Amino acid sequence: DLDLAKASATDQLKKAKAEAQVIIEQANKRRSQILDEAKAEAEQERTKIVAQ
Amino acid sequence: DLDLAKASATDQLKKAKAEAQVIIEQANKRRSQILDEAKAEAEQERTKIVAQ
Amino acid sequence: AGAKDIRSKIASVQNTQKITKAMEMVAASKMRKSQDRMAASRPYAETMRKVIGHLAH
Amino acid sequence: TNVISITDGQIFLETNLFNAGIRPAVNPGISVSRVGGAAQTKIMKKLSGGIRTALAQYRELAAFSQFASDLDDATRKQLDHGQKVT
Amino acid sequence: QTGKTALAIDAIINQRDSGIKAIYVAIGQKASTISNVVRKLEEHGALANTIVVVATASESAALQYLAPYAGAAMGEYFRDRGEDALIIYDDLSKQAVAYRQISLLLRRPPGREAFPGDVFYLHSRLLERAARVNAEYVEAFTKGEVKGKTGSLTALPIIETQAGDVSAFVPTNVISITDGQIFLETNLFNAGIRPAVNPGISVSRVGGAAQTKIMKKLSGGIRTALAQYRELAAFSQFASDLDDATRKQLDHGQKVTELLKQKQYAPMSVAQQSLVLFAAERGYLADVELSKIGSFEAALLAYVDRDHAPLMQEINQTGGYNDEIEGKLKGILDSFKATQSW
Amino acid sequence: WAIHRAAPSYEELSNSQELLETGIKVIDLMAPFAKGGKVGLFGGAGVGKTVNMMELIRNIAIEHSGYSVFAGVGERTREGNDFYHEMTDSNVIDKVSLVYGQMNEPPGNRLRVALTGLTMAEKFRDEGRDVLLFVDNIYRYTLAGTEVSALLGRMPSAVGYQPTLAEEMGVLQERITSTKTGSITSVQAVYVPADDLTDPSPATTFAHLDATVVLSRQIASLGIYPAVDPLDSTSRQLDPLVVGQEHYDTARGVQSILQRYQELKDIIAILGMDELSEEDKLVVARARKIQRFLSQPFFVAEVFTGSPGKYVSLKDTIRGFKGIMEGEYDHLPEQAFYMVGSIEEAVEKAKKL
Amino acid sequence: QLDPLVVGQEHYDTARGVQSILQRYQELKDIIAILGMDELSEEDKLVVARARKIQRFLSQPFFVAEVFTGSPGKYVSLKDTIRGFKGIMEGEYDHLPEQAFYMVGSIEEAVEKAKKL
Ligand SMILES: Nc1ncnc2c1ncn2[C@@H]1O[C@H](COP(=O)(O)OP(=O)(O)OP(=O)(O)O)[C@@H](O)[C@H]1O
Numbered sequence A, B: 001d002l003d004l005a006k007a008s009a010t011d012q013l014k015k016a017k018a019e020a021q022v023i024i025e026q027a028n029k030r031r032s033q034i035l036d037e038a039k040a041e042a043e044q045e046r047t048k049i050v051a052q
Numbered sequence C: 001a002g003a004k005d006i007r008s009k010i011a012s013v014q015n016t017q018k019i020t021k022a023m024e025m026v027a028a029s030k031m032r033k034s035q036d037r038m039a040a041s042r043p044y045a046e047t048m049r050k051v052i053g054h055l056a057h
Numbered sequence D: 001t002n003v004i005s006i007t008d009g010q011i012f013l014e015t016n017l018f019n020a021g022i023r024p025a026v027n028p029g030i031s032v033s034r035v036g037g038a039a040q041t042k043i044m045k046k047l048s049g050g051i052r053t054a055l056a057q058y059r060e061l062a063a064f065s066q067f068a069s070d071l072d073d074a075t076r077k078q079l080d081h082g083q084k085v086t
Numbered sequence E: 001q002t003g004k005t006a007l008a009i010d011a012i013i014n015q016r017d018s019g020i021k022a023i024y025v026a027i028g029q030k031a032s033t034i035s036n037v038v039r040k041l042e043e044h045g046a047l048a049n050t051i052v053v054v055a056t057a058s059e060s061a062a063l064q065y066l067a068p069y070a071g072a073a074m075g076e077y078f079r080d081r082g083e084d085a086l087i088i089y090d091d092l093s094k095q096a097v098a099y100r101q102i103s104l105l106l107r108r109p110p111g112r113e114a115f116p117g118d119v120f121y122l123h124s125r126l127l128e129r130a131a132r133v134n135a136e137y138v139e140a141f142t143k144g145e146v147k148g149k150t151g152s153l154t155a156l157p158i159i160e161t162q163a164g165d166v167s168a169f170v171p172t173n174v175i176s177i178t179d180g181q182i183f184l185e186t187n188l189f190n191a192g193i194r195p196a197v198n199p200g201i202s203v204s205r206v207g208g209a210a211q212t213k214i215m216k217k218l219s220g221g222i223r224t225a226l227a228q229y230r231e232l233a234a235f236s237q238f239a240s241d242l243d244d245a246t247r248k249q250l251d252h253g254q255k256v257t258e259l260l261k262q263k264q265y266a267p268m269s270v271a272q273q274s275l276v277l278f279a280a281e282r283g284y285l286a287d288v289e290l291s292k293i294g295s296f297e298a299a300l301l302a303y304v305d306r307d308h309a310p311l312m313q314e315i316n317q318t319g320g321y322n323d324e325i326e327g328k329l330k331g332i333l334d335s336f337k338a339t340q341s342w
Numbered sequence F: 001w002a003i004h005r006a007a008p009s010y011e012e013l014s015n016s017q018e019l020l021e022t023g024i025k026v027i028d029l030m031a032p033f034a035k036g037g038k039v040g041l042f043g044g045a046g047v048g049k050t051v052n053m054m055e056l057i058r059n060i061a062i063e064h065s066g067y068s069v070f071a072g073v074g075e076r077t078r079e080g081n082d083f084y085h086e087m088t089d090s091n092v093i094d095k096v097s098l099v100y101g102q103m104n105e106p107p108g109n110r111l112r113v114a115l116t117g118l119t120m121a122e123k124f125r126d127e128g129r130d131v132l133l134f135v136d137n138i139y140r141y142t143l144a145g146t147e148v149s150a151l152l153g154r155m156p157s158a159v160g161y162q163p164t165l166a167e168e169m170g171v172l173q174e175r176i177t178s179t180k181t182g183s184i185t186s187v188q189a190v191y192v193p194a195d196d197l198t199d200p201s202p203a204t205t206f207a208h209l210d211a212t213v214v215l216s217r218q219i220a221s222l223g224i225y226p227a228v229d230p231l232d233s234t235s236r237q238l239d240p241l242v243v244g245q246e247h248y249d250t251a252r253g254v255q256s257i258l259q260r261y262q263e264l265k266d267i268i269a270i271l272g273m274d275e276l277s278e279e280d281k282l283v284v285a286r287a288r289k290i291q292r293f294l295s296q297p298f299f300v301a302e303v304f305t306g307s308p309g310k311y312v313s314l315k316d317t318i319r320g321f322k323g324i325m326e327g328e329y330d331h332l333p334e335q336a337f338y339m340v341g342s343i344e345e346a347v348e349k350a351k352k353l
Numbered sequence G: 001q002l003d004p005l006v007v008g009q010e011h012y013d014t015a016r017g018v019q020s021i022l023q024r025y026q027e028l029k030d031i032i033a034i035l036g037m038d039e040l041s042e043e044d045k046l047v048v049a050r051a052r053k054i055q056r057f058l059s060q061p062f063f064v065a066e067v068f069t070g071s072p073g074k075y076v077s078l079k080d081t082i083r084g085f086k087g088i089m090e091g092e093y094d095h096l097p098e099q100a101f102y103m104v105g106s107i108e109e110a111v112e113k114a115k116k117l
């Protein structure tokens, strides 16, 4: 009984660890995106201040 | 031993489904740490660029 | 030492390097032929072990 | 090196080729004409294209010559042609 | 194109808050590059603490030859008043070429590689002014207006060398004038190991006397372990003879080099550096993958920035290494390794 | 105007670091030009040097509003004649000025021709344009300065060069910059004596070059045009801090794929394709698609290919190589990418190929 | 001063033995560079192993280098060094690893360091 049971239960733990990297990968992606946005606004703000 | 083993296989099958979730839970927390530190560094950087 | 003999050494080592590249290519091809000759040696021993197994065991 | 800067090409004559009995000792791949096919007549322009590639392939497979070529075929045909044009 | 300038301006920028005045002398450089450097100094706010001296590649050779001597004369003002200053000479090889031009236009008989023999005397009298002076000199110079302080001028000359040849004339002249060298290798730089410092050649004759106690203790033999790891890797490429301790020596060296690379314009304080060195040599990078090393530090320096901040403020103030501080560091690395993820 | 001037002063230089959008996929990806930079063309004749020069002249005249100046320093009169005919029979001649110093002229002529070209480009800059200056060999400027210095009897230096070598190079190269009104970009052919990169002429020149384009006989043998080599061509504009992280990552990516492919192509040569894993076969496939997609048809090349020429914006090259690297477009064949244009044109080629 | 009459035969003979081995190792470096060590003769491998041990045993910690090495310094008497080199050349230490000879004052310290690996 532990045959199908251990294989299918351990496989889903391997999946959950793989998916844990997926979650953390997306967080670092959005951190990059958030960084671009903040930097672009800061430089745009500087552009307007200098023109004024 | 069939009744012990069928229960013990179910106990095991239960256990991996739980532990998969607590990994995925912890990963979503770690994401939330990474993104909040992304918001903090995003603001810290902007305060430099305006002084420039 | 002396640039005219150094240039002679360079040409000698360059010629040596081409020939070793040729020997690498040949050794790979001979490995292939000798591993085909290897597979053909299996069936004789495998069936002889089955006959010995039949009598012995 | 001055006159190689001035001219349109060179015919480069090698003494090891001369000693080997390649005579005239023209050394291909380091002798070249920057005018090229425009100088030739149509027939020579048509036929000479193969010789240049054939001799270059002979230079690559010259390393396999002295050490034996018994371990390859298609190359043994490319080598055989390359030596016969040489 | 090995990061010589990047390393020198990142040194300038890190003195932005350390109270050391900075001077940057650009000899024979491109004016576009010089304006971009000045704009990067201003972008980081270091510019208010620097003097910049310019002689572009377009200008007469005499202006280039006298360019570094002019820069030295400004640096000596701070030294003689008992302050500290740092001076960068952006290419002393370009000064020597300019002096060679002027010297040969005056028909002076050339020597090795066509430089005059005066070319040692040229770079000698320049660099030998970068000095530290005792308080009796500062008092006697300033007629007693400053008591008990000691001034210094710190110099980082740059030499560009052809194909990495450390045995050419002008490189060997300056190696014989300075107190050491940092040798930057293009093979490391092209492999992405940046800054591309080659141990075994690089040295500081002054020695640890320049380090803080904590940095002196935590660094120790890390230099010679890296030099040996690079030599072992050379023979290990050639044959297979792996005897476990070789395997662990290779893993440790590969993790240390992956830990020593660093980004441009991202300086890190002595508290951060001492944690990184502590984590490397107390073995904590065991169980950590090479592809995880950069993540491991970024998480660790955020962890210590978040919670155990007061120690950081202590180690940055006085670079003191105690058993109390070692215990706190041990608890921080034990808890991080056990409790956090990267 | 007089040919002799000082370079722009410190306050005149542009307070920014713009790129030039050449329109060529290999160049704009792998070796981007700073506006007002110096580029070295490190290839021998046989490889398309002049057609590449004519394509840049066309794109900067049409797709910008720039003019070009060509300075033939120490050129063979024959090649000077038939470069003029190849430009006149390709309609680019109305958008370039030609100054020729033929080798049969005394040394003083050849030295000063380089400055005559530069002063004409300075006029077009002062009108506010962005300008291309082509120097047909920078080595022949160096050697003209040596010969004149020897005639004047000054003591030689280094490997027998003039004592003023670094100054005379600096006097030329520092006038070629981006100012606040316009810019001069330069593309300079380089010859390396004895194949020696340590010789003072190469060593002095490489201090001034920003980008470096290598042209290959092998890539031409593949039929891939333009025949730029992606692994030896480089630019010091490839950093995130100036070019941004998407472009940097993409250029680093295709370099890694092409390098790995070269190693795999040696393994295939000694041991055939049976040694490759699925990962290796995917790498080899994408590398062949990337190699195909670096080809392009020029408006100058229509005489041969007959295909209409294409100008490709930098965004479209970044989209294309991002796509091929991350395994999109794996489902359409490699010959769809060859000589096509944009990646959007590659798939539309594929649909009936 | 390196004469049998001035320094005695045992010193002279040990110094010429060290030079003879180290020169022979230089003669082997070109074949080692091209082909590596496995194509050497079976006693040429022994020469290379002794020469590398001799090269490392010439190294020594200095009392003025504690600012650099940090290792304590060493003073080695003449009698003690010639005994060490003679013993390596006779091969009584041919079972220690190379690293054991690096930066050690006397042969004793090499066998002690080999106990610490
Ligand atoms: N820490 C780093 N990481 C990655 N790249 C770097 C780093 N530091 C410098 N570089 C890169 O090195 C290149 C050359 O920088 P830099 O000009 O300082 O080097 P250099 O050897 O001083 O050049 P030059 O010799 O022209 O003066 C630039 O692309 C720069 O971005």
Ligand SMILES: Nc1ncnc2c1ncn2[C@@H]1O[C@H](COP(=O)(O)OP(=O)(O)O)[C@@H](O)[C@H]1O
Binding pocket: F044, F045, F046, F047, F048, F049, F050, F051, F052, F225, F226, F296, F297, F298, F301, F304, F305
């Ligand atoms: N895009 C292209 N399409 C077709 N042929 C090309 C292309 N680029 C270069 N060639 C060919 O390359 C060869 C050499 O070009 P060319 O400009 O004459 O080089 P060079 O002038 O340096 O000898 C010519 O046959 C030319 O047709």
Ligand SMILES: [Mg+2]
Binding pocket: E003, E004, E005, E006
């Ligand atoms: Mg620099």
